[PDB]
Amino acid sequence: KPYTIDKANSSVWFEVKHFKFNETRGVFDSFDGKIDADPNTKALNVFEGKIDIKSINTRNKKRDDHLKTAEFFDVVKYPKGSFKMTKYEDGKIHGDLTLHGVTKPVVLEAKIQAPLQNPMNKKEFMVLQAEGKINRKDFGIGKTFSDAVVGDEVKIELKLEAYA
Amino acid sequence: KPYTIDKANSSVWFEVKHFKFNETRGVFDSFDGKIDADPNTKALNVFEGKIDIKSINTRNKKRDDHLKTAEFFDVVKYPKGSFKMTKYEDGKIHGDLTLHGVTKPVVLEAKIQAPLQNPMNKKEFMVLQAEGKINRKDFGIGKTFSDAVVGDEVKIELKLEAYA
Numbered sequence: 001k002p003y004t005i006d007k008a009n010s011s012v013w014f015e016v017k018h019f020k021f022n023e024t025r026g027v028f029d030s031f032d033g034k035i036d037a038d039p040n041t042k043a044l045n046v047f048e049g050k051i052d053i054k055s056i057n058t059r060n061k062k063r064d065d066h067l068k069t070a071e072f073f074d075v076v077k078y079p080k081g082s083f084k085m086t087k088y089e090d091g092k093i094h095g096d097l098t099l100h101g102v103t104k105p106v107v108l109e110a111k112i113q114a115p116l117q118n119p120m121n122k123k124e125f126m127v128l129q130a131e132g133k134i135n136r137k138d139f140g141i142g143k144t145f146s147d148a149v150v151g152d153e154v155k156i157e158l159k160l161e162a163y164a
Numbered sequence: 165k166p167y168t169i170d171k172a173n174s175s176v177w178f179e180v181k182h183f184k185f186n187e188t189r190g191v192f193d194s195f196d197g198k199i200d201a202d203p204n205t206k207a208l209n210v211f212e213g214k215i216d217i218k219s220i221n222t223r224n225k226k227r228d229d230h231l232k233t234a235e236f237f238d239v240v241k242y243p244k245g246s247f248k249m250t251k252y253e254d255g256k257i258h259g260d261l262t263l264h265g266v267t268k269p270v271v272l273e274a275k276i277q278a279p280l281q282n283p284m285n286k287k288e289f290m291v292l293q294a295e296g297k298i299n300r301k302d303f304g305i306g307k308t309f310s311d312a313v314v315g316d317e318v319k320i321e322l323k324l325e326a327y328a
């Protein structure tokens with residue numbers, strides 16, 4: 001305890017229904033975080049992070065540009081998203097998520113594997129993976145888009161490799 | 165039947181274990197395909213595709229550049245991968261997948277949502293989801309890389325919206 005996120009091997013994903021039945025996936029290419037944890041016992045002590053909203057991906061310029069617009073994220077007015085863990089208990093990461101200028105308490109379900117050793121450079125690391133779901137409309141993201149076109153519900157998955 | 169894949173809302177995903185405990189996900193940004201199907205009954209009649217191996221993504225240059233080397237895919241020698249369905253039965257796409265110059269039989273579990281109507285332009289479509297797994301080593305890709313560094317098992321997910 002503490003840990004630094006390896007960015008080449010770490011990821012922040014979302015998945016949202018498109019037209020009810022197809023799952024549209026994307027990432028934020030640019031994020032940062034703080035982690036402090038006991039690899040034995042697997043307790044998380046510190047867990048916060050930030051996403052840079054302009055780095056949203058999805059792999060389609062048209063869609064992604066439209067996502068940074070006032071119709072969805074409003075990147076100009078809100079360049080960042082943030083999450084601060086406020087409580088850890090047995091796999092539950094309770095925390096305040098802030099998106100589009102709104103903060104809501106949420107809970108991510110998490111899994112830690114640790115202590116691990118990078119078989120190349122011999123350095124100690126941990127994998128942290130977490131999953132939640134939120135309603136984009138609770139954060140006022142895309143009110144004008146119906147659930148039948150863009151799902152209200154958004155699955156969040158974090159996949160982190162972090163070096164002691 | 166026939167149908168024409170909407171490339172803007174379709175994707176080809178893979179997922180493989182990194183150092184056993186974390187998943188590396190990525191896509192082929194560029195692919196083509198043929199589909200013929202019955203909206204009712206949900207029978208698939210024709211299902212084939214090609215991917216351009218150079219479009220491999222993963223969002224990491226050092227990694228993606230390595231994947232394209234003779235160490236893995238050798239894109240300079242095998243520019244393409246391809247799949248053709250050989251038989252459709254009780255929700256399963258049986259077919260032949262060709263990667264790195266090797267063809268092997270693979271089974272994909274399919275899920276068809278059809279008939280669907282585009283809420284905006286009222287045009288008819290379907291969502292086709294297909295999932296399966298291969299051993300990358302069965303095709304000779306990355307023989308020198310241990311399963312504990314890069315998983316031998318690779319999960320394939322196809323997510324297509326296709327318009328009549």
Ligand SMILES: CCCCCCCC/C=C\CCCCCCCCCCCC(N)=O
Pocket residue numbers: 012013014016018024031032033048049050051063067081082083099136150154156158
């Ligand atoms: C890294 C440690 C702390 C984690 C920071 C968490 C930030 C939250 C990560 C994801 C948050 C969810 C953002 C909502 C994305 C959904 C965007 C709407 C996509 C619409 C798709 C479309 N069809 O146009």
Ligand SMILES: CCCCCCCC/C=C\CCCCCCCCCCCC(N)=O
Pocket residue numbers: 176177178180182188195197212213214215227230231245246247261263300314318320321322
């Ligand atoms: C209908 C289209 C036909 C194509 C269907 C095939 C879909 C994908 C097929 C194979 C995917 C194999 C991908 C395995 C890539 C290995 C990724 C290794 C990443 C980490 C490597 C490292 N050294 O860090």
